[model samples]
Target: MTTSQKHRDFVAEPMGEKPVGSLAGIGEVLGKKLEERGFDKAYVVLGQFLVLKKDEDLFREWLKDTCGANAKQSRDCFGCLREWCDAFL
Candidate 1:
């Protein structure tokens, strides 16, 4: 699958202190929900990725229930996190 500008930008380097909204597929709508669940920061969400042991299926399920993310949205978000981990973790 081709990556979007947002996905490339997100994985270009360390996430640093970017907000969760900076994540691919995590627009204002999903970001607000994630923030409400105390996942306001990109690193915070990364923690969840780690906690799920980077399992794609589990992570996708979590994203769906946690933020009402659809398949494509969760997939994009998962892909971004997965790549970030591969590069930096």
Candidate 2:
């Protein structure tokens, strides 16, 4: 699959203090929703990914339920998070 420039930049280093919008799939609207649910930062979502043991199915569902992300959005977010773990965790 062809990754986005956003994806590459995200996985290029530790998540640090990047906002949730920095993720591949999250946008301003989604970021706001996520923040309301206490996922205001990329690292917070990464914590959930780790807690889910990086399970794709679980992460996807969690993303959908947490912020109403659609299938493709969930997939992209999951993919980016997975890659981030592979590179940094």
Candidate 3:
């Protein structure tokens, strides 16, 4: 599937304190898991993504391992954060 509208909108602008679910790949279940793991805010996850130097393989692996995400899920999430950073970070 193509990226969701939310994903596009998020990457298009600053996320500011949006919830984890506001992220492209983070639905309810993954959002809950992320929040439980101290990633309640979109920016927090963005911080980690930046800390990982936006490495696709490492970030994707970390997201998958942390939330049992499939490849597509991890990719979407990574792409969202990566593009957002490129645009506004």
User: What lDDT does each candidate get?
Assistant: 0.95, 0.92, 0.88
lDDT for model 2: 0.92
TM-score versus the correct structure, for each prediction: 0.96, 0.96, 0.93
The candidate with the higher TM-score, 2 or 3, is 2
Per-residue C-alpha lDDT of model 2 across residues 1-89, encoded as one tens digit per residue:
59999999999999899999999999887889999999988999999998999899999999999999999899889999999888988
Q: By lDDT, highest first, what's the ranking?
A: 1, 2, 3
Clashing pairs in 1: none
Least well predicted 10-residue stretch by lDDT in candidate 1: 1-10
Q: Write the per-residue lDDT of candidate 3 for residues 1-89, one digit (tens) a residue.
A: 47789789898778988898888888899988888889899999898898999999999999987878788888889999988988987
Cα error of candidate 2 at position 65, Å: 0.5
Per candidate, the number of residue pairs that clash is 0, 0, 0
Alpha-carbon deviation at 47 in model 2, angstroms: 0.4
True-structure RMSD, every candidate: 1.0, 0.9, 1.4
